Design an enzyme around this catalytic site. Structure first.
Site, mmCIF file in Angstrom:
data_model
loop_
_atom_site.group_PDB
_atom_site.id
_atom_site.type_symbol
_atom_site.label_atom_id
_atom_site.label_comp_id
_atom_site.label_asym_id
_atom_site.label_seq_id
_atom_site.Cartn_x
_atom_site.Cartn_y
_atom_site.Cartn_z
ATOM 1 C CB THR B 40 -1.003 0.119 1.183
ATOM 2 O OG1 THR B 40 -0.042 0.467 2.235
ATOM 3 C CG2 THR B 40 -1.773 -1.152 1.611
ATOM 4 C CG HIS B 45 3.680 2.219 8.418
ATOM 5 N ND1 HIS B 45 3.017 1.786 9.561
ATOM 6 C CD2 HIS B 45 2.792 2.148 7.415
ATOM 7 C CE1 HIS B 45 1.786 1.461 9.238
ATOM 8 N NE2 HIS B 45 1.621 1.661 7.943
ATOM 9 C CG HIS B 48 3.517 -2.903 8.308
ATOM 10 N ND1 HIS B 48 2.425 -3.414 7.611
ATOM 11 C CD2 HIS B 48 3.749 -1.698 7.762
ATOM 12 C CE1 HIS B 48 2.027 -2.535 6.718
ATOM 13 N NE2 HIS B 48 2.823 -1.478 6.788
ATOM 14 C CE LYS B 82 -6.662 -0.864 4.422
ATOM 15 N NZ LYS B 82 -5.902 -0.749 3.138
ATOM 16 N N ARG B 86 -10.842 2.727 -0.804
ATOM 17 C CA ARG B 86 -9.521 3.179 -1.213
ATOM 18 C C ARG B 86 -9.483 3.211 -2.741
ATOM 19 C CD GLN B 173 -6.252 -11.930 4.816
ATOM 20 O OE1 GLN B 173 -6.586 -10.778 4.423
ATOM 21 N NE2 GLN B 173 -5.794 -12.069 6.055
ATOM 22 C CG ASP B 194 -7.000 -4.805 10.596
ATOM 23 O OD1 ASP B 194 -6.665 -3.716 10.105
ATOM 24 O OD2 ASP B 194 -6.263 -5.780 10.454
ATOM 25 N N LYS B 228 -3.608 7.842 18.374
ATOM 26 C CA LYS B 228 -3.260 6.784 17.424
ATOM 27 C C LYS B 228 -1.776 6.440 17.397
ATOM 28 N N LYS B 231 1.096 7.892 15.083
ATOM 29 C CA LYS B 231 0.606 9.130 14.470
ATOM 30 C C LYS B 231 1.376 10.322 15.058
ATOM 31 C CB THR B 232 4.774 11.150 14.103
ATOM 32 O OG1 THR B 232 4.893 10.051 15.085
ATOM 33 C CG2 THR B 232 5.959 12.070 14.058
#
Lengths: 317, 317
Positions: B40, B45, B48, B82, B86, B173, B194, B228, B231-232
Site C-alpha cells: 500500500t 512502517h 507493521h 478502513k 480506497r 485472503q 482487524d 493513534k 501518528k506523529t
C-alpha cells in the site's frame, strides 16, 4: 414506434428502461439488440419461446439480433426467478449443452438477410479468459454491495440464502452487455421478466464506463387458472423433437384453454391483429369448433418443427 | 504453551480461534504459520512491526514463518480497518512496491536455520493466473453473502458504502490460507486486530474444502493518551531509512511517554520478563533518567536498522 406499439398490443412488454427514447431510436436506426440463453439443459423449452420469437419480431422490423449462448454464465448460474441455490454443472456438461442450444436458436433467426443478419455468440469467449483480478477491478469497482443487494434476484434470497457465486452472476451479465455494446454496437438487451435487475446492471456498467442503451423485459406468460405456464403432467414441453415429439408439442397447444388461447396467439404467433381479432369473435361464436386452438397449434408447430413435422402431428392426431 | 503464555504476558494475543488446540500443536510440532503484507506504499512502517516481530518470536521458538507479500490482494484492497473505500493502485505501482517490501521483510527473519528457515512468498503467483469462473466456483460456492456481510470489515461499511471489489477481498485472503495450508502445511495464520474476519474466512474455506488450523490476531497498539499509535506530527515512521532516518526512528522511540514505555518494551523487544520488570521498577524509582526509553530506542533501532545505524543515531543525538 409501430414495432413497439405492436408488442404492447400483444402484451410482450413487461418493462422498459425508457420507452420514448427506445421508440425513437428504433424508429431512426437499425438497432442491434441481444438476448442471453444459459444452457441449464440439453434443450431449450417453451419457457424460452417468448423472448426467442420476440427477437424474431425485432428482426422482421429491420433490426439486428444477437442470440447469446451462456457458455460462461451457465457455469455460475442465475438465481433470477429461482427460489433455491442451484447445483453447479460441469464444464463438459455445459459445453455439450451449449452446442445444441446453439442449434435450436438458429432455427428462429435469419442469417441470409444483408443489413440485419443474426449472430449467435458465446460469452465463454470473453469470460473464459478473464482473470479474477481484472474482473474484480474493471467490473467490480463500479458496483456497491448495496446496489446489488436490493436487486430482486438477491433481495429474494438472503434468508433463503445465496452463495457469493450466484450473487456475482449479475456482474457477468453486466459485463456481457458492455462487451456487446462495444464490439457490436449493441443498444438493447431483452429478456424475460426476471432479467430486469441483470439488464439494469449492464446499464449501470455502461453508464459508469462510458457515460445511450435500453432494456426491455417480456412478461411471465399467464394461465387464467393461475397455474404455471408450461407445467404439464408429462413434464416439460421441449423444443427438441426427440424429447417432445411434434405430436406431443402439437397436442400441448391444441389443449390451450379457451381462456388462454387469445393471449397465446398474440404472444407466440405471427398472425396479424385483424387475424387474431377475427379468431376472437370465432371463439365467442363457435367455441366447440376450436379454431383458435388449431391455428395456434399449427403456427407454433411449424415455427419450431416445420410443416412436414406438423403434417405428421396432424395425421397422427 | 510457554511461547503462547509469553505472548500473552506481553499482550500480543488479541484473539485466537482455539487456544488449547493451538497451544497443544505448538507444543507437539514445528508449526508453519504465515502473515500477509499488502504493498500500500513503497515501505512498511511501524504499524507493521508487531506482527513482524511476532513472526520472529514464533521462529525463535522453533516454528516456520512464511511472510506473504500481497502482490495480488494489493491490487484489490482490504477494507479491514478502513472507514473508506480506497483507490486502486496500478499493477506497475504495486509490482514495484512489492520488491521493496520483500526486502524489508527479510531483515526480520532467519533464512539460514535448517528445519525452520523462513519463506517470503507472493500471492500473485497463484492469484495472478486464476480465471474468474474458477474463482467464483471453487472459492465462491463455499460462502453465502450473509456470512460475508456480518464480517466486521463489511458490516463496518455498507451505509458508508463498499464496492463489490473490496467486498470480495476476503475471498482472496481465504484462498491464500487454503493454498498455503495445502502446499506448505500452513496451520496458523496471524495478523493484526482487524484481520480476524479475513482469517476466520480462510478457516471457513479450509473447513469446507477439507473438513485442523488456527488463527491468532495481535491487538491494536495503544497509547495512554488515547491517540493513534505511530501518528506523529512528522507523519509516518517508516522502516526505510531513506524515508525516516535512523536518527528520527530513534528519536520517535526515545520520546515514548512514561505511560507507554513498558507496554512497548513487551511488544517490540526481545528483552526478558525479568529485564522488562527491572526496567519497570527503574521507571518507578528514577523516571527522569529515561532508562526504559533508551533501551527501547536502542533495541528497536538495532532490530530495524542495525548497530552502526544506532551508533550514528546516538552520536547524532
Amino acid at each position: 414506434m409501430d414495432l413497439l406499439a405492436e408488442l404492447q398490443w400483444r402484451g410482450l412488454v413487461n418493462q422498459t428502461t425508457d420507452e420514448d427514447g427506445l421508440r425513437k431510436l428504433l424508429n431512426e436506426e437499425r438497432v442491434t439488440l441481444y438476448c442471453g440463453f444459459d444452457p441449464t439443459a440439453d434443450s431449450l423449452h417453451i419457457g424460452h419461446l417468448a423472448t426467442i420469437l420476440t427477437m424474431r419480431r425485432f428482426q422482421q422490423a429491420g433490426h439486428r439480433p444477437i442470440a447469446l449462448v451462456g457458455g460462461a454464465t451457465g457455469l455460475i448460474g442465475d438465481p433470477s426467478g429461482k427460489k433455491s441455490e442451484r447445483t453447479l454443472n460441469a464444464k463438459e456438461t455445459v459445453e455439450a449443452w451449449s452446442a445444441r442450444i446453439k442449434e435450436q436458436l438458429g432455427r428462429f433467426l435469419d442469417f441470409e438477410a444483408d443489413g440485419n443478419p443474426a449472430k449467435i455468440k458465446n460469452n465463454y469467449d470473453w469470460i473464459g479468459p478473464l482473470d479474477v483480478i481484472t474482473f474484480l477491478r474493471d467490473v467490480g469497482k463500479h458496483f456497491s454491495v448495496n446496489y446489488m443487494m436490493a436487486k430482486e434476484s438477491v433481495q429474494s434470497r438472503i434468508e433463503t440464502g445465496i452463495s457469493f457465486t450466484e450473487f456475482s452472476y449479475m456482474m457477468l451479465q453486466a459485463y456481457d452487455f458492455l462487451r456487446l455494446y462495444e464490439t457490436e454496437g449493441c443498444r438493447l438487451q431483452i429478456g424475460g421478466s426476471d432479467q430486469w435487475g441483470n439488464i439494469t446492471a449492464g446499464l449501470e456498467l455502461i453508464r459508469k464506463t462510458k457515460g445511450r442503451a435500453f432494456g426491455l423485459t417480456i412478461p411471465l406468460v399467464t394461465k387464467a387458472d393461475g397455474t404455471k405456464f408450461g407445467k404439464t403432467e408429462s413434464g416439460t414441453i421441449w423444443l427438441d423433437k426427440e424429447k417432445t415429439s411434434p405430436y406431443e408439442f402439437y397436442q400441448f397447444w391444441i389443449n390451450t384453454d379457451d381462456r388462454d388461447v387469445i393471449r397465446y396467439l398474440k404472444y407466440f404467433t405471427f398472425l396479424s391483429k385483424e387475424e387474431i381479432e377475427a379468431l376472437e369473435q370465432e371463439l365467442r361464436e363457435a367455441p366447440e369448433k376450436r379454431a383458435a386452438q388449431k391455428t395456434l397449434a399449427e403456427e407454433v408447430t411449424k415455427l419450431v418443427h416445420g410443416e412436414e413435422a406438423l403434417r405428421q402431428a396432424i395425421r397422427i392426431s
